[PDB]
Design a protein around this ligand. Structure first.
Ligand SMILES: *[C@@H]1O[C@H](CO)[C@@H](O[C@@H]2O[C@H](CO)[C@@H](O)[C@H](O)[C@H]2NC(C)=O)[C@H](O)[C@H]1NC(C)=O
Ligand SMILES: *[C@@H]1O[C@H](CO)[C@@H](O[C@@H]2O[C@H](CO)[C@@H](O)[C@H](O)[C@H]2NC(C)=O)[C@H](O)[C@H]1NC(C)=O
Ligand SMILES: *[C@@H]1O[C@H](CO)[C@@H](O[C@@H]2O[C@H](CO)[C@@H](O)[C@H](O)[C@H]2NC(C)=O)[C@H](O)[C@H]1NC(C)=O
Ligand SMILES: *[C@@H]1O[C@H](CO)[C@@H](O[C@@H]2O[C@H](CO)[C@@H](O)[C@H](O)[C@H]2NC(C)=O)[C@H](O)[C@H]1NC(C)=O
Ligand SMILES: *[C@@H]1O[C@H](CO)[C@@H](O[C@@H]2O[C@H](CO)[C@@H](O)[C@H](O)[C@H]2NC(C)=O)[C@H](O)[C@H]1NC(C)=O
Ligand SMILES: *[C@@H]1O[C@H](CO)[C@@H](O)[C@H](O)[C@H]1NC(C)=O
Ligand SMILES: *[C@@H]1O[C@H](CO)[C@@H](O)[C@H](O)[C@H]1NC(C)=O
Ligand SMILES: *[C@@H]1O[C@H](CO)[C@@H](O)[C@H](O)[C@H]1NC(C)=O
Ligand SMILES: *[C@@H]1O[C@H](CO)[C@@H](O)[C@H](O)[C@H]1NC(C)=O
Lengths: 176, 226, 319, 123
């Protein structure tokens, strides 16, 4: 429903409404339920109910804490974006929380010994920071006309009226 | 009808008090000015984070990363981009100030003509027949409380332009000739108050074969015993 | 009977800023992102102008809450109002003088669009016909409460009583007054039906709004020191890091043209406000009452006035 | 806007694509969450797919309105659209209608009738 919102940068901000064009998982998108062969388009949201096996056929490995890559280091949500970055937070219900970053640094992946697989898309959100600098809300602009109106006025409440938001144009179908 | 007029005035002041003491948002014309000024200042502040073609929007990390031979080429773009935004802001403030000045001149004319005297201009000091007005102060504005006369509860009658009595037409000093079906009376124009037609509230001009619509009646003579 | 013409509103134009600067080019719309919020400023200014133009027409014409009707017995003591009252043979509310006035004014995409008004010409004609019917059947009483009926000859008698002349003058010269009024309306009808062009104040607004749009279209064929005025030719002849410095010059010139246009549109709308406020005050003090101000409603001792609609304007007929 | 075919020598014309605009008619967020979408002057046949086809399609002189049930009544105007058409939110939905200019009244004029007020109201 509303999953896959992290802190897009390392700069502290508070009580603002910042607009970030970043690769996100779109709201109300369909994800596969497992209880195998999993491709890699641009980035994968992961959840669970041990570790991971990445690569193409080098191999990127996480077991459980030791990591083989060469590099080595000694209800759970995981954003695996690759610029390989791991975001993680644990406490699919209707809830929503911001995923704090953990660590920093492929055409398929796998897992060790139920989970979920999402796929990130080029989007543009509108984050709501708070007094403590954490994220409490977000708005996907290209979901519906109401959220596009919220992205235009840059608020989360809209007054009664009529608002010009964008324009449309049929794309060129084929080349000649 | 002094007591009735007093109670109606008190009830009207109480209803103004109630419609302000509720959550009825009425000061939108005053809130618009504050909103537009705050929005113009917020846009002018947010224009400082644009780089206008340069490598950054901060002047300090340009000066601490480049030498003055090829740093001024970066600085000139920011100088032109900020001059343009200042010029736009000042131009639109000059255009808003003339509208505010026209509204202030209208408020001064209303203060002179509605409060310091009684006005005959229609719908200038409220809707109806103007009596008097009161000022009340507001944040960056003024609020006028116009007190007007409104007629109510009309009634149909039969009218006539003149009266022929002794072969002479009779015209009213002020008011209209009305009739309730059997008798004829002269009354004033804005409040029904019928009176007997005598030779002290009429005047005579000519004979009664020229006016289109003249009606026979008796015009009383007040010096009856002498 | 004289004629007074005032402008009320003008054409509601809108601009697609991104398309006018560089349509169908994402690597130019990404270069327009380096300038902050300019197109939102320009769209906010033009949207405020567009709402302002509907507010002008609303406050000039919508000054009644009823819609009055003229009675089917038109016996008004000898006066003849058929040239200005509505005519049902035509498919509108419009009248004969209003047909002449609508036929006199005859002038009438890179983002440049024109928005329609809120009130239509038929609705504005219904407002003016309600104003005429209320005036003729009730005097000035319908602007201060409930419309009270009165015969038209008695109304005209104590409109004479408000300029210092008694009412026996009217009740003894009624036929002459009626014939002079009918001949004056006929002379107005003849001087409007002839080829005299008297709607110059309304034609000036249309010509001044057309020249600005034609200049704004004409500025798209200037190179501004670049190699071409066509963006696709630069994008097909150059690599991107050499096309940057040409697209920047085109963006700078087209932003300068847009800003000049928007500033002059703001300054031109500022006087249409003043003309619409003057027209609203003249409506309230000439049509809804009788005015003692010298040379405000006509030229002479004022009796009564009639409103007529016009393309982006209003015409008063002062008696 | 015109060009010659370089192989068949044919005179074939050029016109641009659709190019409209999009407005969003909505109440407050403290009342509902449904919207309506106005497409600027496209005549409803060349037009998100729920807001492209389906029921609740209405043709205006200002454009193509999708998501609002047109009725035959006439109310005080609530949200202006253009050319006489207004919109309002009324088991609850968004409607579109032709706005009314006021009530109906006919003054009972004759040549010998007058109406005189008998009372008053201080306002
Ligand atoms: C019109 O007004 C006259 C005012 O005089 C009315 O005449 C009086 O009516 C009362 C009835 O209450 C009688 O007691 C008086 O004797 C009448 N006076 C005269 C001089 O006739 C008359 O009734 C009214 N007519 C209508 C139809 O209301
Ligand atoms: C108003 O009164 C006058 C005077 O009584 C009427 O005039 C004359 O009336 C008599 C009798 O009715 C006629 O024989 C005369 O021919 C009338 N003279 C004129 C010059 O008309 C008059 O008819 C009355 N009007 C009404 C409407 O009753
Ligand atoms: C008011 O003036 C008009 C003229 O504008 C009169 O209309 C004429 O009506 C007669 C028939 O009654 C026609 O034969 C004429 O052709 C009409 N004139 C025109 C110019 O078409 C109208 O009759 C006048 N009103 C009254 C009550 O006399
Ligand atoms: C004054 O008289 C007129 C004329 O009778 C009244 O208007 C009538 O109102 C009724 C409504 O009950 C209609 O059926 C009639 O058709 C109307 N007559 C005309 C000629 O239009 C009017 O209501 C009266 N007003 C007052 C205050 O008494
Ligand atoms: C004029 O209207 C006023 C209403 O504003 C009437 O005053 C009311 O009269 C009734 C009589 O039954 C009293 O019960 C109310 O208390 C009065 N109201 C106030 C505010 O005093 C008045 O009677 C009317 N006058 C006429 C002649 O009808
Ligand atoms: C911020 O944290 C404090 C305690 O750490 C808490 O009392 C407060 O409610 C928090 N505010 C928000 C907006 O979460
Ligand atoms: C008023 O009109 C009627 C016809 O309805 C007519 O008989 C009467 O003579 C007229 N009155 C005047 C004064 O013209
Ligand atoms: C618009 O559509 C209607 C019917 O859908 C049609 O009658 C009319 O001709 C169309 N107009 C244009 C300009 O295509
Ligand atoms: C509105 O009126 C038209 C008649 O012109 C009718 O065909 C249509 O069904 C009506 N629609 C509604 C919702 O009443």
């Amino acid at each position: 429903f509303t999953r896959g919102v992290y802190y897009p940068d390392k700069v502290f901000r508070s009580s603002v409404l910042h607009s970030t064009q970043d690769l996100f998982l779109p709201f109300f998108s369909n994800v596969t339920w497992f209880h195998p062969v999993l491709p890699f388009n641009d980035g994968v949201y992961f959840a669970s109910t041990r570790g991971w096996i990445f690569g193409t056929t080098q191999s990127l490995l996480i077991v459980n804490v030791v990591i083989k890559v060469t590099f080595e280091y000694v209800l759970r949500e995981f954003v695996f974006k690759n610029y390989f970055k791991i975001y993680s937070k644990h406490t699919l219900p209707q809830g929503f929380s911001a995923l704090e970053p953990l660590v920093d640094l492929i055409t398929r992946f796998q897992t060790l010994l139920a989970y979920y697989v999402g796929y990130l898309q080029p989007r543009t959100f509108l984050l709501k920071y708070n007094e403590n600098g954490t994220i409490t809300d977000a708005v996907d602009c290209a979901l519906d006309p109401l959220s596009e109106t919220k992205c235009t006025l840059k608020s989360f409440t809209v007054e009664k009226g009529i608002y010009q938001t964008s324009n449309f144009r049929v794309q060129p179908t084929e080349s000649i | 009808n002094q007591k009735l007029i007093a109670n109606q005035f008190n009830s009207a002041i109480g209803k103004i008090q109630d419609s302000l003491s509720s959550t009825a948002s009425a000061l939108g014309k005053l809130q618009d000015v504050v909103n537009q000024n705050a929005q113009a200042l917020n846009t002018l502040v947010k224009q400082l984070s644009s780089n206008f073609g340069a490598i950054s929007s901060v002047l300090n990390d340009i000066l601490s990363r480049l030498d003055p031979p090829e740093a001024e080429v970066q600085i000139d773009r920011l100088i032109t981009g900020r001059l343009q935004s200042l010029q736009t802001y000042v131009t639109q403030q000059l255009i808003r100030a003339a509208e505010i000045r026209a509204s202030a001149n209208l408020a001064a004319t209303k203060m002179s003509e509605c409060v310091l005297g009684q006005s005959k201009r229609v719908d200038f000091c409220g809707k109806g027949y103007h009596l008097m007005s009161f000022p009340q102060s507001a944040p960056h504005g003024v609020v006028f409380l116009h007190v007007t006369y409104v007629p109510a509860q009309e009634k149909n009658f039969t009218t006539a332009p003149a009266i022929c009595h002794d072969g002479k037409a009779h015209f009213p000093r002020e008011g209209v000739f009305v009739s309730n079906g059997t008798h004829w009376f002269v009354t004033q124009r804005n409040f029904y108050e019928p009176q007997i037609i005598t030779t002290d509230n009429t005047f005579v001009s000519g004979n009664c074969d020229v006016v289109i619509g003249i009606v026979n009646n008796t015009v009383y003579d007040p010096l009856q015993p002498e | 009977v004289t004629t007074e013409i005032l402008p009320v509103s003008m054409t509601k134009t809108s601009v697609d800023c991104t398309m006018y600067i560089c349509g169908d080019s994402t690597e130019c719309s990404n270069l327009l992102l380096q300038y902050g919020s300019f197109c939102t400023q320009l769209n906010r200014a033009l949207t405020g102008i567009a709402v302002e133009q509907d507010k002008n027409t609303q406050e000039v014409f919508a000054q009644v809450k009823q819609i009055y009707k003229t009675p089917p017995i038109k016996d008004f003591g000898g006066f003849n109002f058929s040239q200005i009252l509505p005519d049902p043979s035509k498919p509108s509310k419009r009248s004969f003088i209003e047909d002449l006035l609508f036929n006199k004014v005859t002038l009438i995409f890179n983002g440049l669009t024109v928005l329609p008004p809120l009130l239509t010409d038929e609705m504005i004609a219904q407002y003016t016909s309600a104003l005429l019917a209320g005036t003729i059947t009730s005097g000035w009483t319908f602007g201060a409460g409930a419309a009270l009926q009165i015969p038209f000859a008695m109304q005209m008698a104590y409109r004479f009583n408000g300029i210092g002349v008694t009412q026996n003058v009217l009740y003894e010269n009624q036929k002459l007054i009626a014939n002079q009024f009918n001949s004056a309306i006929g002379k107005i009808q003849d001087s409007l039906s002839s080829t005299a062009s008297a709607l110059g104040k309304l034609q000036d607004v249309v010509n001044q709004n057309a020249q600005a749009l034609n200049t704004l279209v004409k500025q798209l064929s200037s190179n501004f020191g670049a190699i071409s005025s066509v963006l696709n030719d630069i994008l097909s002849r150059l690599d991107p890091p050499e096309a940057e410095v040409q697209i920047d010059r085109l963006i700078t010139g087209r932003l300068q043209s847009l800003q000049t246009y928007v500033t002059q549109q703001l300054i031109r709308a500022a006087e249409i406000r003043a003309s619409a406020n003057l027209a609203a005050t003249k409506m309230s003090e000439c049509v809804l009452g009788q005015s003692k101000r010298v040379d405000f409603c006509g030229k002479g001792y004022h009796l009564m006035s009639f409103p007529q609609s016009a393309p982006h304007g209003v015409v008063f007929l002062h008696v | 806007d015109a060009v010659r075919d370089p192989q068949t020598l044919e005179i074939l014309d050029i016109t641009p694509c659709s190019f409209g605009g999009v407005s969003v008619i909505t109440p407050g967020t403290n009342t509902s969450n449904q919207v309506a979408v106005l497409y600027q002057d496209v005549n409803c046949t060349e037009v998100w797919r729920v807001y492209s086809t389906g029921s609740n399609v209405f043709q205006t002189r200002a454009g193509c309105l999708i998501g609002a049930e047109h009725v035959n009544n006439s109310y005080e105007c609530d949200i202006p659209i253009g050319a006489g058409i207004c919109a309002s939110y009324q088991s609850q939905s968004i409607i579109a209608y032709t706005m009314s200019l006021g009530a109906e009244n006919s003054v009972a004029y004759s040549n010998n009738s007058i109406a005189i007020p008998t009372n008053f109201t201080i306002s």
